[PDB]
């Protein structure tokens, strides 16, 4: 089998992905955030508390002829950012892009912080990290990838992020006209439960390449790009009026600028992310402040590949007996 669904920015600014997902009998659509950062499948529902719901839609598991409490067990989870959410769990049929598994967690939240209850256009989260991080207790839960995995063609999904435009996660199968060039594959760490990989080093705008290993993972749940502050400062001082603002939380540059490209190694091989794809726009309405795309993970304990950098590339995310990462530019 296969799947292929369009997966949508949801604002100007790519500040997230939103994929339609079928939950239940009959199909409950709700548009889900897909995360290669985390492994629970969870939704705003019925059971969310009505105060911690503004504008989601929810899936309303009485309303399912497939659904079944999974009786006793509960999720909680805590993301990079702050937000976390918790609840129950149910199992049931979950489609995407034609693609469905029977059987799958879905886990029903009871609460959710501020910052999701303030997103009204995500209605939950779709991991696809290593199914080792999943937060079901007291029985761990399988990712729907997991859960699909035997049944796909070929054990993998895509990643093909849009720069603020749709584009497309795939299952089961490599479309070979979503690419330019050739893939080039690199080793899988799967030790702390993420896609996590070794760079092989960067550029800035038109510089010469740096070679320099660059442990991180790649997250289709974060906005940005976060490497060590070596290298966010090197990408920086390139623009004029550039500066690390504390009071903002990251670097700032001037909105007039033209911000170069900057360039990561994937074997020998390279990925190009233009330099529009990190402005990140006013940090308040109506400033002349822009934020930046490229932030220090200094503070985070781990560098991260967030969407700034998966959008410049076609992304594979091979599950095979041992998993590796592909990238071509496109
Ligand atoms: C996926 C992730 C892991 C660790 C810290 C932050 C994030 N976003």
Do not use: M
């Not at 989870?77 to 937000?83: A, L, M, Q, T």
């Not at 999943?134 to 720069?163: H, I, M, R």
């Amino acid at each position: 089998s296969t799947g292929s669904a369009t997966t949508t920015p949801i604002d100007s600014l790519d500040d997230a992905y939103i994929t339609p997902v079928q939950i239940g009998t009959p199909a409950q659509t709700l548009n889900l955030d897909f995360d290669t950062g985390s492994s629970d499948l969870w939704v705003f529902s019925s059971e969310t508390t009505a105060s911690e719901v503004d504008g989601q839609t929810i899936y309303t598991p009485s309303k399912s002829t497939t659904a079944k409490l999974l009786s006793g067990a509960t999720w909680s989870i805590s993301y990079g950012d702050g937000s976390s959410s918790s609840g129950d769990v149910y199992t049931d049929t979950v489609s995407v892009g034609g693609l469905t598994v029977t059987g799958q967690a879905v886990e029903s939240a009871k609460k959710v912080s501020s910052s999701f209850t303030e997103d009204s256009t995500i209605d939950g989260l779709l991991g696809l990290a290593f199914s080792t991080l999943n937060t079901v207790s007291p029985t761990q839960q399988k990712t729907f990838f997991d859960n699909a995995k035997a049944s796909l063609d070929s054990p993998v999904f895509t990643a093909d992020l849009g720069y603020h435009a749709p584009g497309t996660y795939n299952f089961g199968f490599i479309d070979t006209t979503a690419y330019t060039g050739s893939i080039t594959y690199t080793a899988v760490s799967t030790k702390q439960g993420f896609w996590e990989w070794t760079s092989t080093g960067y550029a800035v705008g038109s510089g010469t390449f740096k070679s320099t290993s660059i442990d991180g993972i790649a997250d289709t749940g974060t906005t940005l790009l976060y490497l060590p502050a070596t290298v966010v400062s090197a990408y920086w001082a390139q623009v004029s009026g550039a500066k690390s603002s504390s009071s903002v939380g990251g670097y700032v540059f001037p909105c007039s600028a033209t911000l170069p490209s900057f360039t990561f190694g994937v074997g020998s091989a390279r990925i190009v992310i233009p330099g529009d794809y990190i402005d990140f726009g006013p940090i308040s309405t109506g400033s002349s402040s822009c934020f930046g795309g490229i932030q220090s993970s200094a503070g985070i304990g781990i560098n991260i590949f967030g969407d700034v950098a998966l959008k410049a590339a076609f992304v594979v995310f091979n599950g095979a007996t041992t998993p590796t990462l592909g990238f071509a530019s496109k």
